Design a protein around this ligand. Structure first.
Ligand SMILES: Cc1ccc(S[C@@H]2O[C@H](CO)[C@H](O)[C@H](n3cc(-c4ccc(F)cc4)nn3)[C@H]2O)cc1
Ligand SMILES: [Cl-]
Length: 138
């Protein structure tokens, strides 16, 4: 397994048609996972499954600019399960990140950070065993 937290460089940032694939297994009794697509210190797209927020499971997405989190976008469809293998696919489209989990569409997140070629890191964190993290063009 890869070390977590994991830093995947995205050379020259992201671009529409770029597909990022994360494979891993959720730990037993997991509490949280995060993907952080970063522009320097800013977080263009934070994708954060929370397994126990007031005894509910929710995915929280947001952007961090100059160290400040913005308006959250929340999704109660929650495709992860403790102890189970998953695939997250993040497809960069012209106007949003499109996320599918286990080949099922989950959510879109409109681009708030607009210099896509400066979003040149993906951080992967939390309660997973990380099998692989990679990108390809479709
Ligand atoms: C004014 C105010 C007060 C509190 C908060 S809470 C905040 O909410 C954000 C989304 O809006 C992010 O989720 C953020 N966060 C989570 C993680 C994380 C790191 C490793 C990991 F495995 C899972 C998750 N890193 N940063 C969380 O601290 C927000 C605003
Ligand atoms: Cl969290």
């Amino acid at each position: 397994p890869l070390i977590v937290p994991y830093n995947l460089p995205l050379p020259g940032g992201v671009v529409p048609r770029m597909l990022i694939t994360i494979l891993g297994t959720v730990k037993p009794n997991a509490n949280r996972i995060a993907l952080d697509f970063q522009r320097g210190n800013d977080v263009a797209f934070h994708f954060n499954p929370r397994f126990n927020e007031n005894n509910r499971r929710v995915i929280v997405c947001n952007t961090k600019l100059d160290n400040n989190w913005g308006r959250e976008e929340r999704q109660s469809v929650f495709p992860f399960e403790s102890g189970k293998p998953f695939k997250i696919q993040v497809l960069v489209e012209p106007d949003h990140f499109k996320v599918a989990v286990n080949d099922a569409h989950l959510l879109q997140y409109n681009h708030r950070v607009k210099k896509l070629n400066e979003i040149s890191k993906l951080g992967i964190s939390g309660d997973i065993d990380l099998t692989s993290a990679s990108y390809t063009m479709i």
